[PDB]
Design a protein around this ligand. Structure first.
Ligand SMILES: NC(=O)c1cccc2c(O)c(Cc3ccc(C(=O)N4CCN(c5ncccn5)CC4)cc3)oc12
Length: 240
């Protein structure tokens, strides 16, 4: 029998579809349950509440569990970016069947053999500031309505801000990331800081950007070391 807390046991069962504690160790990730009552949990629930897009109206989201995560070796990998400016807490969704690999190997760039279809700025690691934009990538359904989503600290630095698809060969000198500019953005006046990381949990407003292909922002880094995975949420999708 497992010596892990029940919510972690349930997470492992979800990810692996060996004993629980053996499957836990395969993730090479410290997983802690975040207390419901805590400042962190309050902030995260607000981020989920406030950044569900109006056009993503097929479902609403309920947070079941919040986990704080620390991948083995992450501290030393992220160190060269830990002091870069413009570090933001951003969403990344993925199918549940991908999470064993994501936690054990981290988020990775798609290999050459994968289609570039779906990647408007070329292969990289993609994030949203609107929970629903990322939650769509969980590919949940009425029959399978529980999904997993990440919050990563992403070291964005100087952003190369684009409005139309462009598979850039290289970042311009002095740039660290790409930001796709959407028509709607979390209200920047509502940004808060959590442990030195900016959290854009404002309700969506018009960005005032015209001549753009994107409804909502997206953020791309091209070096896996610019990501520090921080939280993993188990979400209930309530389909309408
Ligand atoms: N995932 C997000 O939260 C996200 C956020 C904002 C913009 C995009 C945006 O344009 C994408 C692109 C995207 C493009 C292609 C795929 C895609 O098809 N993928 C294949 C499956 N996959 C995977 N398989 C095995 C191991 C690990 N991963 C994940 C990738 C998935 C997503 O994802 C976004």
């Amino acid at each position: 029998k497992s010596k892990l807390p029940k919510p972690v046991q349930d997470l492992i069962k979800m990810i692996f579809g060996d004993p629980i504690d053996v499957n836990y160790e395969k993730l090479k990730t410290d997983i802690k349950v975040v207390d419901r009552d805590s400042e962190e949990a309050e902030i995260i629930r607000k981020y989920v509440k406030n950044t569900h897009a109006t056009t993503h109206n097929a479902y609403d989201l309920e947070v079941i569990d919040i986990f704080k995560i620390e991948r083995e070796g992450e501290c030393q990998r992220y160190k060269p970016f830990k002091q870069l400016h413009n570090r933001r807490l951003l969403w990344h969704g993925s199918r549940t069947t991908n999470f064993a690999g994501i936690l054990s190997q981290g988020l990775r760039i798609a290999p050459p053999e994968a289609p570039v279809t779906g990647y408007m700025f070329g292969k990289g690691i993609y994030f949203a500031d609107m929970v629903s934009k990322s939650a769509n990538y969980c590919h949940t359904s009425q029959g399978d309505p529980i999904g997993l989503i990440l919050l990563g600290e992403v070291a964005l630095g100087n952003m190369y801000e684009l409005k139309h698809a462009s598979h850039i060969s290289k970042l311009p000198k002095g740039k660290h990331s790409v930001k796709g500019l959407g028509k709607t953005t979390p209200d920047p006046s509502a940004n808060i800081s959590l442990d030195g990381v900016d959290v854009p949990l404002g309700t969506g407003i018009s960005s005032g950007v015209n001549d753009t292909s994107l409804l909502y922002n997206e953020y791309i880094v091209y070096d896996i070391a610019q990501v520090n995975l921080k939280y993993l949420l188990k979400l209930k999708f309530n389909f309408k």
